[PDB]
Design a protein around this nucleic acid. Sequence first.
RNA 1: CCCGGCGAGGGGAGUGAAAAAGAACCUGAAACCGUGUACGUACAAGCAGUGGGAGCACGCUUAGGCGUGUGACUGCGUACC
RNA 2: GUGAAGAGGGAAACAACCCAGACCGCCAGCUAAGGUCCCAAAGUCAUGGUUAAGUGGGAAACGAUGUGGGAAGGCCCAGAC
RNA 3: GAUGUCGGCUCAUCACAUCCUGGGGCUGAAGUAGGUCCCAAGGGUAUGGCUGUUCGCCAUUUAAAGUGGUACGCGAGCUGG
RNA 4: GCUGAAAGCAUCUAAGCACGAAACUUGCCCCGAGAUGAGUUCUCCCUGACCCUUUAAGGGUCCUGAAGGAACGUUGAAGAC
Lengths: 142, 56, 209
Amino acid sequence: MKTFTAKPETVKRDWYVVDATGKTLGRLATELARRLRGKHKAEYTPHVDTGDYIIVLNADKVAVTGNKRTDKVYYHHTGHIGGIKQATFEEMIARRPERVIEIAVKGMLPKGPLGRAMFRKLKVYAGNEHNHAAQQPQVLDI
Amino acid sequence: AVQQNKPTRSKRGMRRSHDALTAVTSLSVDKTSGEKHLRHHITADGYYRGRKVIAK
Amino acid sequence: MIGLVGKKVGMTRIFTEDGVSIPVTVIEVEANRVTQVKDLANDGYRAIQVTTGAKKANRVTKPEAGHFAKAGVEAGRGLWEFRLAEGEEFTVGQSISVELFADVKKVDVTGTSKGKGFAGTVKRWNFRTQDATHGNSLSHRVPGSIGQNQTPGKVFKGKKMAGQMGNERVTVQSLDVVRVDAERNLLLVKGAVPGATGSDLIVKPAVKA
RNA sequence: CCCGGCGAGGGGAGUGAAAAAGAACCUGAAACCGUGUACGUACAAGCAGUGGGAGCACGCUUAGGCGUGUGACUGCGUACC
RNA sequence: GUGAAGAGGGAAACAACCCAGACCGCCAGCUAAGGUCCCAAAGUCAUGGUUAAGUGGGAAACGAUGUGGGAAGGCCCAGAC
RNA sequence: GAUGUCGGCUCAUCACAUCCUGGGGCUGAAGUAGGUCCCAAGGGUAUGGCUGUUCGCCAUUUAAAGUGGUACGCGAGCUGG
RNA sequence: GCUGAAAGCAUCUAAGCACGAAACUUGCCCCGAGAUGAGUUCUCCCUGACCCUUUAAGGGUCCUGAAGGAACGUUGAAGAC
């Protein structure tokens, strides 16, 4: 008896909408990554993307404990010798809040072609409105 | 100055992907002699645009 | 405010009664016809598309003809856009002349610089030439070292090397406006501007001010 | 006999058990280089395999859900002497 | 004692450290070190405390009304600081 | 069974224990001009005489002629004193 | 620095509030939707008829060949190609 393996052509994916207001960044991110990978489904398969589409609203209202709102620094290198550029949590929220949640979730997903595919199912919006009503998203409290 | 490893037959083929020749798209037909020829060139019989330019 | 599109006629000078010679660039600015108006509701930003000059009918493609037909203007030799400063209103088919530069006193001129082709480091980056004698061996104009030893073990991005020079967009800022000849559709600006004779130029009021 | 430059080199014809024994000639391996077919491959990083594994093609099969080829994706994995 | 002549698990990677000595097969189970929010298998476990420094996750003499706990003492409704 | 070793030339790049420029506290800071310490690496940061010299001395400049890392950066880039 | 407790006072700080540099984010110039997250806007073009079948993002025949593109030619203050 071979162990059951999910098939990408017959895998069911649902749509959920999550409100990030007042939610701890990391704790919220873990649940998103867990569901984006399909770890909550009994038919989870490591080599198949069995996760669900998730819409995140009010990304600019995410919360961080301690002094992380001004002390957490995001580093990235442009590739040139000058290179290193940094931005604090406050600046990222003011400049482009969606990247804060996207960056956090991206680090918790597996690395590789499948991990990138999982990240594609995450939709993050700074405001309280999304244009995915045609997908009939279901409210998810996490 | 010289290679440290032998390039593969695959690498050789990928370098030659741009070596393919391009055939002439089409040949013009002379008004009078009806001979196929390169556009803007005289025909093998000495015609050009049905004028009989120089044959001897 | 908005700018205008002109052609680099050439360079000359203007003699002043005080005995001063002003090197000027003659820019022919024909009437600029507005071909499209963009707003936040439909395009997300405020701007106007303009055209100038004339184009041969047989050289105008059907997609281009329809764009001009919608605005009801004669086809030009190109299309350019200018952002609106929250206080400018224009309508399609409106003709904009060089008269709007009458009270600017300084403009920004943009154009495509002359193309030098493949240029060496000496010409392109003002690299210092090595000795022409004293034992030099085939290294009179070569760049020289391009990096350091094993520690980096590579050449950093942006390293100055030989390559294409010129034939690129260039802007010269804060050029005095010497004269504005509306009847002759001419604009005289002190100094030189990028590009060769007959090249398209974009003239805008100076932003530095 | 035919193409070709009264060429080179071939295609027929004929000889022979055999011409894929044609004189560059018994057998005709490997490296190496090609044509055809199946599958994979242009958002993906490393001793190139291994374990798992969808899809496709194909052969089965008294549907028997197996075999063969390919290998999206994924765990682990830095040649030999 | 181990490596040398020793694979496996852990210490991110890491012959010599920790756990443990691979006869072969199994898509069975229990454990060691080490671990149980996600990458990544398993507690966002239970109870009582400490830390606010991202200390945890690099370091001294020495400096300081940071903060928790403990045993004493001086002066105080004859009115203290 | 080779990892070209001083100096110059060309071309650099990073660190900040800052030479100049910028912002400050103290001063035995009247002013001008300084001393010392703190913040700050955006840009800038001599030419010659002698010597193979780096260095150094000297002449004359400059707002300043900073200190170090980069195989005491750089010979499949040059030079060979 | 202001206000201000912990600590009747004092205190720029613990709640709250205002200043502060060539550094930082912008402002200026250039590249830029392979930004596979491949975006937006305007305009233009195509309005046949059948067959086969393992009947589907299927294959084939006839008719049709648009917008536009490329090619070729004369060439450029564009250019190694």
